């Protein structure tokens, strides 16, 4: 699924994101914006063999179990395939368990790189929430 800028807000906002961890609902609006332009089915493969999926672009080197990635965790307890679906519930619930784990959302380089320090709440500008 790709999703509009504010049906995603709100989307987001409904699973429990605004604020989580201090972290205001613009900054989860633009990290998707920029790790995976608000497509679900959204996947890339690093260079350690390890690969990216879904809307927050969350790792299978650490988070979630792709059966190819030797060596890695899935500290979310999911199948990284759940990570694509058109129900962020997968991706929101181990976004909370990934920006609860220490350096908060810098874990997405993307977030760093384009959005931390940024008008934030521009992305959330005209949405009904
Ligand atoms: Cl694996
Ligand atoms: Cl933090
Ligand atoms: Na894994
Ligand atoms: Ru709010
Ligand atoms: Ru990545
Ligand atoms: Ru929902
Ligand atoms: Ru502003």
Request: proline fraction near 2%; charge should be positive; charged fraction near 20%.
């Amino acid at each position: 699924k790709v999703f509009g800028r504010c049906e995603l807000a709100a989307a987001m906002k409904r699973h429990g994101l605004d604020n989580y961890r201090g972290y205001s609902l613009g900054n989860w609006v633009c990290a998707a914006k920029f790790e995976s332009n608000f497509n679900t089915q959204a996947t890339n493969r690093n260079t350690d063999g390890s690969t990216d999926y879904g809307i927050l672009q969350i790792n299978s080197r650490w988070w979630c179990n792709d059966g190819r990635t030797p060596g890695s965790r899935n500290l979310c307890n999911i199948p990284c395939s759940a990570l694509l679906s058109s129900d962020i519930t997968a991706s929101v619930n181990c976004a909370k368990k990934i920006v609860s784990d220490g350096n908060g959302m810098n874990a997405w380089v993307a977030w760093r790189n384009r959005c931390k320090g940024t008008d934030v709440q521009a992305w959330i500008r005209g949405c009904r929430l």
